[PDB]
Amino acid sequence: SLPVLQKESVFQSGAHAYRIPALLYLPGQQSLLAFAEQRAELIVLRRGDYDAPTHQVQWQAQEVVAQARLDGHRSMNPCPLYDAQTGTLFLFFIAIPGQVTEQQQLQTRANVTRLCQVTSTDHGRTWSSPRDLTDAAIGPAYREWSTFAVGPGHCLQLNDRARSLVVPAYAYRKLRPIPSAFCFLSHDHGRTWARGHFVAQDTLECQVAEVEQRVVTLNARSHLRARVQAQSTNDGLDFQESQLVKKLVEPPPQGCQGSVISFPSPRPAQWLLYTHPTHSWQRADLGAYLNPRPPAPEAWSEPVLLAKGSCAYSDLQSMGTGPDGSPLFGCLYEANDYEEIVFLMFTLKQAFPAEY
Ligand SMILES: CC(=O)N[C@H]1[C@H]([C@H](O)[C@H](O)CO)OC(C(=O)O)=C[C@@H]1NC(=N)N
């Protein structure tokens, strides 16, 4: 394990069970928003204020994102998104009928999953009513899908003309059900939602990052022994290029979700950071990977050990300049056989004292 600034558990599986973390930074108020699935069942949230003096994050009391649900459906895969332009907070998620499951939908081929979002204009303190965007965003294609999902994890807003909203997703499309990664795009600040195109075969949960002319790189889990990296030159509408990244291992089963963010290069305008279990055959040993010449896959560094032991899902968030003057990061990840979601806060200089 690497020397960090903070390591506290934001969610602990005691009187309840938590999974599928989601982190979101608010640069204006230097606050983090920690989302997670509670039991699926509901989506909880926990705001934690970053205190500069102690180089700490004081986490407030958690709460149930109540409106983030649909009667008779259970909520899953929280995907927070902050529109800097309008200062609107978006929380996407997936709603599934009562006890129905993924395998039930995959085997039955009867998609019943629902794409939703709630928004907050006072920083997730209170939320708008749920807006079911299924039909409008997916359209006819919905009948060709056995099921689909968003995130989990932070979404992405672009620096293009419209400051477009990008939401990573994947779906089991028919051709027998094959999963593919794609993005839901909004060029009107969430007003309306189009649906981008798919990547090469077999790609599940994924996250997107931007980098500078302007390409959106996607990192998705696969059933292969590695991660798949797709690049879009038309803002996520199409991901023309797609490669398997050998250095980015994926545990045996069907892989494990991962997280990728972009941040200000110390010297391309950005660099990429990526967290994922590094262990060879099991979900353990969460590692951090650095790409100093993005999107070049062969530019991916070796992982740096973040946490030894059982580590599954994760979500990263850039948090501006850290104490040592280098980039500061916030990492939300599942640990100890899903008995808790641990928060980690460290700097570039702390994780990669060489490439700095
Ligand atoms: C919606 C849903 O069923 N999400 C699954 C996810 C999913 O099965 C894979 O990405 C591909 O099907 O896998 C895993 C997983 O641990 O591999 C947990 C997620 N669980 C929850 N979000 N509750």
mmCIF file of C-alpha atoms and ligand atoms in Angstrom:
data_model
loop_
_atom_site.group_PDB
_atom_site.id
_atom_site.type_symbol
_atom_site.label_atom_id
_atom_site.label_comp_id
_atom_site.label_asym_id
_atom_site.label_seq_id
_atom_site.Cartn_x
_atom_site.Cartn_y
_atom_site.Cartn_z
ATOM 1 C CA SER A 1 0.000 0.000 0.000
ATOM 2 C CA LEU A 2 1.086 3.552 -0.912
ATOM 3 C CA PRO A 3 1.365 6.506 1.570
ATOM 4 C CA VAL A 4 -1.760 8.650 1.219
ATOM 5 C CA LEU A 5 -3.278 11.760 2.798
ATOM 6 C CA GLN A 6 -6.464 10.081 3.959
ATOM 7 C CA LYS A 7 -8.037 6.634 4.151
ATOM 8 C CA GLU A 8 -11.393 6.462 5.884
ATOM 9 C CA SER A 9 -14.471 4.370 5.203
ATOM 10 C CA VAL A 10 -17.302 6.521 3.904
ATOM 11 C CA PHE A 11 -19.716 3.568 3.741
ATOM 12 C CA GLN A 12 -19.491 0.495 5.959
ATOM 13 C CA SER A 13 -21.501 -2.700 5.659
ATOM 14 C CA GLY A 14 -22.905 -2.917 9.165
ATOM 15 C CA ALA A 15 -26.674 -2.478 9.552
ATOM 16 C CA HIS A 16 -26.760 -2.329 5.728
ATOM 17 C CA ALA A 17 -24.711 -3.454 2.663
ATOM 18 C CA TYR A 18 -23.135 -1.109 0.089
ATOM 19 C CA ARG A 19 -21.731 -1.458 -3.424
ATOM 20 C CA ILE A 20 -21.025 0.302 -6.725
ATOM 21 C CA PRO A 21 -19.296 3.541 -5.615
ATOM 22 C CA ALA A 22 -19.504 6.916 -7.444
ATOM 23 C CA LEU A 23 -17.462 10.009 -6.629
ATOM 24 C CA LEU A 24 -17.985 13.600 -7.709
ATOM 25 C CA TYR A 25 -15.945 16.721 -7.010
ATOM 26 C CA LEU A 26 -17.361 20.244 -6.764
ATOM 27 C CA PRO A 27 -14.419 22.614 -7.375
ATOM 28 C CA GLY A 28 -16.461 25.638 -6.330
ATOM 29 C CA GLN A 29 -17.046 24.431 -2.789
ATOM 30 C CA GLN A 30 -14.194 21.905 -2.640
ATOM 31 C CA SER A 31 -16.681 19.224 -1.657
ATOM 32 C CA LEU A 32 -16.998 15.588 -2.673
ATOM 33 C CA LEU A 33 -20.196 13.678 -3.284
ATOM 34 C CA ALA A 34 -20.073 9.948 -2.549
ATOM 35 C CA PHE A 35 -22.880 7.838 -4.015
ATOM 36 C CA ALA A 36 -23.444 4.111 -3.556
ATOM 37 C CA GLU A 37 -26.038 1.361 -3.876
ATOM 38 C CA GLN A 38 -27.623 0.384 -0.574
ATOM 39 C CA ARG A 39 -29.235 -2.991 0.187
ATOM 40 C CA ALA A 40 -29.988 -3.778 -5.447
ATOM 41 C CA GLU A 41 -32.278 -1.404 -3.565
ATOM 42 C CA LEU A 42 -31.527 2.312 -3.162
ATOM 43 C CA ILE A 43 -28.880 4.930 -3.866
ATOM 44 C CA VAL A 44 -27.373 6.769 -0.909
ATOM 45 C CA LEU A 45 -25.195 9.847 -0.816
ATOM 46 C CA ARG A 46 -22.576 11.367 1.440
ATOM 47 C CA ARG A 47 -21.109 14.860 1.137
ATOM 48 C CA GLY A 48 -17.628 15.349 2.555
ATOM 49 C CA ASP A 49 -16.025 18.764 2.876
ATOM 50 C CA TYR A 50 -12.312 18.970 2.153
ATOM 51 C CA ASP A 51 -10.422 20.768 4.923
ATOM 52 C CA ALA A 52 -7.176 22.266 3.612
ATOM 53 C CA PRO A 53 -5.439 22.705 7.020
ATOM 54 C CA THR A 54 -5.567 19.041 8.006
ATOM 55 C CA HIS A 55 -5.445 17.978 4.343
ATOM 56 C CA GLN A 56 -8.612 16.062 5.163
ATOM 57 C CA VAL A 57 -12.159 15.440 4.050
ATOM 58 C CA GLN A 58 -14.786 15.676 6.780
ATOM 59 C CA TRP A 59 -17.654 13.474 5.611
ATOM 60 C CA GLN A 60 -21.145 14.606 6.561
ATOM 61 C CA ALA A 61 -23.960 12.168 7.410
ATOM 62 C CA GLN A 62 -25.232 9.931 4.602
ATOM 63 C CA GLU A 63 -28.739 10.059 3.182
ATOM 64 C CA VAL A 64 -31.038 8.300 0.734
ATOM 65 C CA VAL A 65 -31.433 9.969 -2.621
ATOM 66 C CA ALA A 66 -35.162 9.433 -2.251
ATOM 67 C CA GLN A 67 -36.408 10.811 -5.565
ATOM 68 C CA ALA A 68 -33.764 8.702 -7.329
ATOM 69 C CA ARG A 69 -36.255 5.865 -7.756
ATOM 70 C CA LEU A 70 -39.302 4.575 -9.613
ATOM 71 C CA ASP A 71 -42.195 2.840 -7.865
ATOM 72 C CA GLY A 72 -41.738 -0.929 -7.991
ATOM 73 C CA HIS A 73 -38.236 -0.671 -9.423
ATOM 74 C CA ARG A 74 -34.904 -0.955 -7.620
ATOM 75 C CA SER A 75 -32.182 1.662 -8.267
ATOM 76 C CA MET A 76 -28.645 0.809 -9.373
ATOM 77 C CA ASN A 77 -25.456 2.196 -10.900
ATOM 78 C CA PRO A 78 -25.252 5.813 -9.702
ATOM 79 C CA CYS A 79 -23.647 8.091 -12.311
ATOM 80 C CA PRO A 80 -23.234 11.658 -11.001
ATOM 81 C CA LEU A 81 -22.486 14.503 -13.406
ATOM 82 C CA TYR A 82 -21.806 18.175 -12.784
ATOM 83 C CA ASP A 83 -22.684 20.722 -15.465
ATOM 84 C CA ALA A 84 -20.294 23.595 -14.693
ATOM 85 C CA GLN A 85 -22.090 25.788 -17.209
ATOM 86 C CA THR A 86 -25.490 25.700 -15.509
ATOM 87 C CA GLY A 87 -24.282 24.497 -12.143
ATOM 88 C CA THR A 88 -26.826 21.681 -12.394
ATOM 89 C CA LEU A 89 -26.077 18.354 -10.759
ATOM 90 C CA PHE A 90 -27.165 15.197 -12.606
ATOM 91 C CA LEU A 91 -27.609 11.747 -11.117
ATOM 92 C CA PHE A 92 -28.236 9.022 -13.674
ATOM 93 C CA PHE A 93 -29.155 5.486 -12.729
ATOM 94 C CA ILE A 94 -30.865 2.302 -13.802
ATOM 95 C CA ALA A 95 -34.293 1.184 -12.618
ATOM 96 C CA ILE A 96 -35.267 -2.506 -12.832
ATOM 97 C CA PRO A 97 -38.666 -4.170 -12.101
ATOM 98 C CA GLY A 98 -39.009 -5.593 -8.583
ATOM 99 C CA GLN A 99 -37.148 -8.879 -8.258
ATOM 100 C CA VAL A 100 -36.266 -9.196 -11.951
ATOM 101 C CA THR A 101 -32.525 -9.634 -12.519
ATOM 102 C CA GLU A 102 -29.902 -9.131 -15.226
ATOM 103 C CA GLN A 103 -29.648 -12.842 -16.046
ATOM 104 C CA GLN A 104 -33.437 -12.953 -16.163
ATOM 105 C CA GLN A 105 -33.405 -10.185 -18.778
ATOM 106 C CA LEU A 106 -30.365 -11.608 -20.570
ATOM 107 C CA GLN A 107 -31.855 -15.084 -20.786
ATOM 108 C CA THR A 108 -35.463 -13.941 -21.352
ATOM 109 C CA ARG A 109 -34.170 -11.328 -23.819
ATOM 110 C CA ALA A 110 -37.017 -9.137 -22.518
ATOM 111 C CA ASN A 111 -35.434 -5.759 -21.718
ATOM 112 C CA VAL A 112 -37.301 -3.990 -18.918
ATOM 113 C CA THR A 113 -34.427 -1.947 -17.522
ATOM 114 C CA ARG A 114 -34.974 1.814 -17.319
ATOM 115 C CA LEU A 115 -32.672 4.802 -17.823
ATOM 116 C CA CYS A 116 -33.249 7.592 -15.304
ATOM 117 C CA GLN A 117 -31.857 10.823 -13.928
ATOM 118 C CA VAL A 118 -32.555 13.250 -11.111
ATOM 119 C CA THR A 119 -31.014 16.695 -10.736
ATOM 120 C CA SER A 120 -30.077 19.066 -7.968
ATOM 121 C CA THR A 121 -29.493 22.806 -8.205
ATOM 122 C CA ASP A 122 -28.433 23.222 -4.572
ATOM 123 C CA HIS A 123 -25.628 20.658 -4.688
ATOM 124 C CA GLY A 124 -27.446 17.377 -4.239
ATOM 125 C CA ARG A 125 -28.890 18.656 -0.962
ATOM 126 C CA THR A 126 -32.361 18.104 -2.464
ATOM 127 C CA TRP A 127 -33.339 16.443 -5.721
ATOM 128 C CA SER A 128 -35.711 16.976 -8.599
ATOM 129 C CA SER A 129 -38.307 14.356 -9.453
ATOM 130 C CA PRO A 130 -37.168 11.301 -11.486
ATOM 131 C CA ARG A 131 -37.199 11.690 -15.239
ATOM 132 C CA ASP A 132 -37.471 8.331 -17.078
ATOM 133 C CA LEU A 133 -35.599 8.925 -20.342
ATOM 134 C CA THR A 134 -35.686 5.347 -21.662
ATOM 135 C CA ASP A 135 -37.806 5.678 -24.831
ATOM 136 C CA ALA A 136 -36.565 9.144 -25.808
ATOM 137 C CA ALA A 137 -32.853 8.423 -25.363
ATOM 138 C CA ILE A 138 -32.754 4.799 -26.606
ATOM 139 C CA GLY A 139 -35.681 4.694 -29.022
ATOM 140 C CA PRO A 140 -36.523 1.625 -31.189
ATOM 141 C CA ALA A 141 -33.142 0.026 -30.473
ATOM 142 C CA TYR A 142 -34.599 -0.738 -27.035
ATOM 143 C CA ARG A 143 -36.252 -3.870 -28.482
ATOM 144 C CA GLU A 144 -32.912 -5.112 -29.843
ATOM 145 C CA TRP A 145 -31.442 -4.860 -26.327
ATOM 146 C CA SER A 146 -31.923 -7.521 -23.644
ATOM 147 C CA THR A 147 -30.761 -4.962 -21.086
ATOM 148 C CA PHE A 148 -28.236 -2.145 -20.652
ATOM 149 C CA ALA A 149 -26.618 0.057 -17.978
ATOM 150 C CA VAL A 150 -24.936 3.394 -17.254
ATOM 151 C CA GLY A 151 -21.585 3.766 -15.521
ATOM 152 C CA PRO A 152 -21.311 3.186 -12.661
ATOM 153 C CA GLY A 153 -19.218 6.216 -11.736
ATOM 154 C CA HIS A 154 -18.736 9.845 -12.741
ATOM 155 C CA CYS A 155 -19.977 10.977 -16.160
ATOM 156 C CA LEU A 156 -18.201 13.436 -18.469
ATOM 157 C CA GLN A 157 -18.815 16.979 -19.702
ATOM 158 C CA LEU A 158 -16.856 18.143 -22.743
ATOM 159 C CA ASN A 159 -15.157 21.455 -23.563
ATOM 160 C CA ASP A 160 -16.675 21.560 -27.028
ATOM 161 C CA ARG A 161 -18.962 24.260 -28.391
ATOM 162 C CA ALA A 162 -21.972 23.068 -26.365
ATOM 163 C CA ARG A 163 -20.163 21.783 -23.255
ATOM 164 C CA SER A 164 -21.959 18.531 -24.096
ATOM 165 C CA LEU A 165 -22.884 15.940 -21.490
ATOM 166 C CA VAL A 166 -21.484 12.450 -22.040
ATOM 167 C CA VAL A 167 -22.728 9.417 -20.127
ATOM 168 C CA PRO A 168 -20.884 6.070 -20.437
ATOM 169 C CA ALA A 169 -23.145 3.063 -20.871
ATOM 170 C CA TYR A 170 -23.222 -0.394 -22.389
ATOM 171 C CA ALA A 171 -25.871 -2.756 -23.687
ATOM 172 C CA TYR A 172 -26.419 -6.416 -24.537
ATOM 173 C CA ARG A 173 -27.413 -6.111 -28.179
ATOM 174 C CA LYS A 174 -28.779 -8.934 -30.350
ATOM 175 C CA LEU A 175 -27.143 -10.068 -33.593
ATOM 176 C CA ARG A 176 -27.480 -14.159 -28.851
ATOM 177 C CA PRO A 177 -26.910 -11.155 -26.442
ATOM 178 C CA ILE A 178 -23.534 -9.425 -26.882
ATOM 179 C CA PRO A 179 -22.530 -6.442 -24.728
ATOM 180 C CA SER A 180 -21.058 -3.241 -26.145
ATOM 181 C CA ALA A 181 -19.959 0.105 -24.739
ATOM 182 C CA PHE A 182 -21.341 3.447 -25.917
ATOM 183 C CA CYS A 183 -22.377 6.914 -24.674
ATOM 184 C CA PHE A 184 -25.606 8.897 -24.247
ATOM 185 C CA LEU A 185 -25.005 12.439 -25.488
ATOM 186 C CA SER A 186 -26.702 15.695 -24.612
ATOM 187 C CA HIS A 187 -25.813 18.910 -26.404
ATOM 188 C CA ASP A 188 -28.341 21.020 -24.553
ATOM 189 C CA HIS A 189 -27.204 20.501 -20.966
ATOM 190 C CA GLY A 190 -29.386 17.462 -20.335
ATOM 191 C CA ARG A 191 -32.379 19.008 -22.095
ATOM 192 C CA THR A 192 -32.517 16.116 -24.574
ATOM 193 C CA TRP A 193 -30.633 12.842 -24.984
ATOM 194 C CA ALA A 194 -29.306 11.197 -28.123
ATOM 195 C CA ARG A 195 -27.570 7.802 -28.153
ATOM 196 C CA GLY A 196 -24.050 7.422 -29.501
ATOM 197 C CA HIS A 197 -22.737 4.436 -31.440
ATOM 198 C CA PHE A 198 -21.261 1.185 -30.070
ATOM 199 C CA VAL A 199 -17.634 0.083 -29.888
ATOM 200 C CA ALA A 200 -16.169 -3.248 -31.055
ATOM 201 C CA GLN A 201 -17.761 -6.374 -29.582
ATOM 202 C CA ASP A 202 -17.787 -7.369 -25.897
ATOM 203 C CA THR A 203 -17.440 -4.314 -23.714
ATOM 204 C CA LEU A 204 -19.308 -3.777 -20.446
ATOM 205 C CA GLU A 205 -19.205 -1.041 -17.803
ATOM 206 C CA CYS A 206 -16.923 1.819 -18.795
ATOM 207 C CA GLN A 207 -15.894 5.392 -18.136
ATOM 208 C CA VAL A 208 -14.852 8.201 -20.482
ATOM 209 C CA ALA A 209 -12.224 10.932 -20.204
ATOM 210 C CA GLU A 210 -11.221 13.812 -22.447
ATOM 211 C CA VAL A 211 -7.757 14.841 -23.615
ATOM 212 C CA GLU A 212 -6.085 17.352 -25.969
ATOM 213 C CA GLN A 213 -7.066 17.789 -31.107
ATOM 214 C CA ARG A 214 -9.995 16.775 -28.870
ATOM 215 C CA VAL A 215 -10.498 13.042 -28.312
ATOM 216 C CA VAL A 216 -12.656 11.163 -25.827
ATOM 217 C CA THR A 217 -10.987 7.991 -24.645
ATOM 218 C CA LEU A 218 -13.124 5.151 -23.254
ATOM 219 C CA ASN A 219 -11.997 2.393 -20.923
ATOM 220 C CA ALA A 220 -14.338 -0.590 -20.593
ATOM 221 C CA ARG A 221 -14.206 -3.987 -18.890
ATOM 222 C CA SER A 222 -14.216 -7.042 -21.111
ATOM 223 C CA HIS A 223 -14.319 -10.801 -20.818
ATOM 224 C CA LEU A 224 -10.861 -10.823 -22.327
ATOM 225 C CA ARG A 225 -7.855 -10.840 -20.019
ATOM 226 C CA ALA A 226 -7.504 -7.094 -20.415
ATOM 227 C CA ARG A 227 -9.244 -3.749 -20.700
ATOM 228 C CA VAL A 228 -10.527 -2.307 -23.967
ATOM 229 C CA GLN A 229 -9.666 1.257 -24.863
ATOM 230 C CA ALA A 230 -11.710 3.106 -27.443
ATOM 231 C CA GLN A 231 -11.067 6.632 -28.751
ATOM 232 C CA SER A 232 -13.605 9.014 -30.265
ATOM 233 C CA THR A 233 -12.658 11.892 -32.588
ATOM 234 C CA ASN A 234 -16.234 13.106 -33.020
ATOM 235 C CA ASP A 235 -17.051 13.613 -29.328
ATOM 236 C CA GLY A 236 -18.355 10.182 -28.392
ATOM 237 C CA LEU A 237 -20.821 9.901 -31.226
ATOM 238 C CA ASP A 238 -18.460 7.376 -32.748
ATOM 239 C CA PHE A 239 -15.469 5.614 -31.222
ATOM 240 C CA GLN A 240 -13.513 4.937 -34.413
ATOM 241 C CA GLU A 241 -10.457 3.343 -32.789
ATOM 242 C CA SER A 242 -10.460 0.437 -30.349
ATOM 243 C CA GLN A 243 -7.593 -1.599 -28.865
ATOM 244 C CA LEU A 244 -7.033 -4.241 -26.185
ATOM 245 C CA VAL A 245 -4.637 -2.951 -23.533
ATOM 246 C CA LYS A 246 -2.561 -5.868 -22.321
ATOM 247 C CA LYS A 247 -0.980 -3.878 -19.422
ATOM 248 C CA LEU A 248 -4.495 -3.324 -18.054
ATOM 249 C CA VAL A 249 -5.412 -6.725 -16.610
ATOM 250 C CA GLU A 250 -8.979 -7.924 -16.048
ATOM 251 C CA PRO A 251 -9.805 -10.652 -13.484
ATOM 252 C CA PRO A 252 -10.877 -14.105 -14.891
ATOM 253 C CA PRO A 253 -14.673 -14.170 -14.360
ATOM 254 C CA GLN A 254 -16.014 -11.421 -16.641
ATOM 255 C CA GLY A 255 -13.736 -8.694 -15.361
ATOM 256 C CA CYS A 256 -14.313 -5.912 -12.839
ATOM 257 C CA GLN A 257 -15.362 -2.296 -13.291
ATOM 258 C CA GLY A 258 -12.602 0.309 -13.368
ATOM 259 C CA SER A 259 -12.203 4.085 -13.260
ATOM 260 C CA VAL A 260 -10.417 6.612 -15.440
ATOM 261 C CA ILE A 261 -10.145 10.385 -15.125
ATOM 262 C CA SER A 262 -8.162 13.063 -16.900
ATOM 263 C CA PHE A 263 -6.226 15.756 -15.097
ATOM 264 C CA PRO A 264 -3.854 18.722 -15.764
ATOM 265 C CA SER A 265 -0.514 17.544 -17.143
ATOM 266 C CA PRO A 266 2.546 18.789 -15.245
ATOM 267 C CA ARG A 267 4.206 19.555 -18.571
ATOM 268 C CA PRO A 268 -0.811 16.556 -24.433
ATOM 269 C CA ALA A 269 -2.734 18.963 -22.198
ATOM 270 C CA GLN A 270 -3.883 16.166 -19.897
ATOM 271 C CA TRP A 271 -2.660 12.933 -18.338
ATOM 272 C CA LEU A 272 -4.831 9.988 -17.355
ATOM 273 C CA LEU A 273 -5.141 8.116 -14.077
ATOM 274 C CA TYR A 274 -6.754 4.696 -13.845
ATOM 275 C CA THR A 275 -7.708 2.519 -10.880
ATOM 276 C CA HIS A 276 -8.502 -1.189 -11.090
ATOM 277 C CA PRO A 277 -7.751 -4.400 -9.172
ATOM 278 C CA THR A 278 -4.309 -5.501 -10.362
ATOM 279 C CA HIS A 279 -4.336 -9.045 -8.986
ATOM 280 C CA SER A 280 -4.068 -11.708 -11.666
ATOM 281 C CA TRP A 281 -7.020 -14.000 -10.954
ATOM 282 C CA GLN A 282 -9.110 -12.244 -8.342
ATOM 283 C CA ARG A 283 -10.558 -8.833 -7.453
ATOM 284 C CA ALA A 284 -7.754 -7.652 -5.176
ATOM 285 C CA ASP A 285 -4.821 -5.249 -4.874
ATOM 286 C CA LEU A 286 -6.324 -2.037 -6.218
ATOM 287 C CA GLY A 287 -3.689 -0.319 -8.324
ATOM 288 C CA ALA A 288 -3.313 3.099 -9.873
ATOM 289 C CA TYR A 289 -2.072 3.470 -13.457
ATOM 290 C CA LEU A 290 -0.632 6.564 -15.144
ATOM 291 C CA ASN A 291 -0.656 7.524 -18.835
ATOM 292 C CA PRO A 292 1.675 10.514 -19.527
ATOM 293 C CA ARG A 293 1.199 10.484 -23.308
ATOM 294 C CA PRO A 294 -2.553 9.806 -23.656
ATOM 295 C CA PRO A 295 -4.244 8.110 -25.355
ATOM 296 C CA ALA A 296 -1.287 5.903 -26.404
ATOM 297 C CA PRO A 297 -2.076 2.574 -24.664
ATOM 298 C CA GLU A 298 1.591 1.549 -24.654
ATOM 299 C CA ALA A 299 2.152 4.731 -22.626
ATOM 300 C CA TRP A 300 0.249 3.136 -19.729
ATOM 301 C CA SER A 301 2.466 2.811 -16.671
ATOM 302 C CA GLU A 302 2.807 -0.209 -14.413
ATOM 303 C CA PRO A 303 0.297 -0.120 -11.576
ATOM 304 C CA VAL A 304 1.198 1.421 -8.207
ATOM 305 C CA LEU A 305 -0.339 -0.414 -5.269
ATOM 306 C CA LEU A 306 -3.176 1.604 -3.708
ATOM 307 C CA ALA A 307 -4.584 -1.058 -1.391
ATOM 308 C CA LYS A 308 -3.566 -4.650 -0.725
ATOM 309 C CA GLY A 309 -6.289 -7.264 -0.405
ATOM 310 C CA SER A 310 -9.873 -7.481 -1.643
ATOM 311 C CA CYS A 311 -10.613 -4.516 -3.873
ATOM 312 C CA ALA A 312 -13.387 -4.421 -6.466
ATOM 313 C CA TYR A 313 -15.212 -1.443 -8.024
ATOM 314 C CA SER A 314 -13.752 2.073 -7.867
ATOM 315 C CA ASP A 315 -14.333 5.652 -9.008
ATOM 316 C CA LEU A 316 -11.711 8.365 -9.315
ATOM 317 C CA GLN A 317 -12.021 12.141 -9.149
ATOM 318 C CA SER A 318 -9.449 14.902 -9.774
ATOM 319 C CA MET A 319 -9.430 17.473 -6.959
ATOM 320 C CA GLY A 320 -7.042 20.229 -8.002
ATOM 321 C CA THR A 321 -3.594 21.028 -6.638
ATOM 322 C CA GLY A 322 -2.558 19.011 -3.599
ATOM 323 C CA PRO A 323 -0.439 20.060 -0.552
ATOM 324 C CA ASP A 324 2.879 19.064 -2.168
ATOM 325 C CA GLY A 325 1.910 21.216 -5.132
ATOM 326 C CA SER A 326 1.144 18.199 -7.342
ATOM 327 C CA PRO A 327 -2.248 16.957 -8.611
ATOM 328 C CA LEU A 328 -4.632 15.728 -5.894
ATOM 329 C CA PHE A 329 -6.943 12.732 -6.342
ATOM 330 C CA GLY A 330 -9.952 11.244 -4.628
ATOM 331 C CA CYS A 331 -10.594 7.528 -4.908
ATOM 332 C CA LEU A 332 -13.790 5.741 -3.868
ATOM 333 C CA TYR A 333 -13.486 1.932 -3.957
ATOM 334 C CA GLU A 334 -15.090 -1.318 -2.671
ATOM 335 C CA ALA A 335 -12.995 -3.330 -0.217
ATOM 336 C CA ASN A 336 -13.007 -6.401 2.066
ATOM 337 C CA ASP A 337 -15.367 -8.668 0.193
ATOM 338 C CA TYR A 338 -17.744 -5.767 -0.402
ATOM 339 C CA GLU A 339 -18.015 -5.058 3.323
ATOM 340 C CA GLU A 340 -17.202 -1.378 2.741
ATOM 341 C CA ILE A 341 -16.449 1.478 0.336
ATOM 342 C CA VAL A 342 -13.146 3.121 1.248
ATOM 343 C CA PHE A 343 -12.178 6.705 0.457
ATOM 344 C CA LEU A 344 -8.616 7.406 -0.517
ATOM 345 C CA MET A 345 -6.975 10.770 -1.094
ATOM 346 C CA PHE A 346 -3.462 11.063 -2.487
ATOM 347 C CA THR A 347 -1.343 13.213 -4.780
ATOM 348 C CA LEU A 348 0.527 12.581 -8.031
ATOM 349 C CA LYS A 349 3.856 13.112 -6.254
ATOM 350 C CA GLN A 350 2.750 10.509 -3.665
ATOM 351 C CA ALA A 351 1.731 7.795 -6.129
ATOM 352 C CA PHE A 352 4.230 8.445 -8.926
ATOM 353 C CA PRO A 353 7.391 10.065 -7.464
ATOM 354 C CA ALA A 354 9.155 9.218 -10.718
ATOM 355 C CA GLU A 355 6.938 10.483 -13.549
ATOM 356 C CA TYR A 356 6.487 13.737 -11.635
HETATM 357 C C1 LIG B 1 -26.776 -3.816 -13.182
HETATM 358 C C2 LIG B 1 -25.856 -4.926 -12.726
HETATM 359 O O1 LIG B 1 -26.335 -6.216 -12.733
HETATM 360 N N1 LIG B 1 -24.621 -4.617 -12.343
HETATM 361 C C3 LIG B 1 -23.597 -5.561 -11.881
HETATM 362 C C4 LIG B 1 -22.427 -5.707 -12.874
HETATM 363 C C5 LIG B 1 -22.845 -6.300 -14.242
HETATM 364 O O2 LIG B 1 -23.379 -7.612 -14.054
HETATM 365 C C6 LIG B 1 -21.679 -6.454 -15.248
HETATM 366 O O3 LIG B 1 -21.074 -5.186 -15.517
HETATM 367 C C7 LIG B 1 -22.105 -7.045 -16.612
HETATM 368 O O4 LIG B 1 -23.392 -7.611 -16.640
HETATM 369 O O5 LIG B 1 -21.461 -6.611 -12.316
HETATM 370 C C8 LIG B 1 -21.148 -6.575 -11.066
HETATM 371 C C9 LIG B 1 -19.969 -7.264 -10.727
HETATM 372 O O6 LIG B 1 -19.609 -7.347 -9.491
HETATM 373 O O7 LIG B 1 -19.189 -7.860 -11.682
HETATM 374 C C10 LIG B 1 -21.939 -5.890 -9.990
HETATM 375 C C11 LIG B 1 -23.055 -5.000 -10.568
HETATM 376 N N2 LIG B 1 -24.099 -4.920 -9.561
HETATM 377 C C12 LIG B 1 -24.891 -3.760 -9.135
HETATM 378 N N3 LIG B 1 -24.715 -2.556 -9.684
HETATM 379 N N4 LIG B 1 -25.802 -3.922 -8.180
#
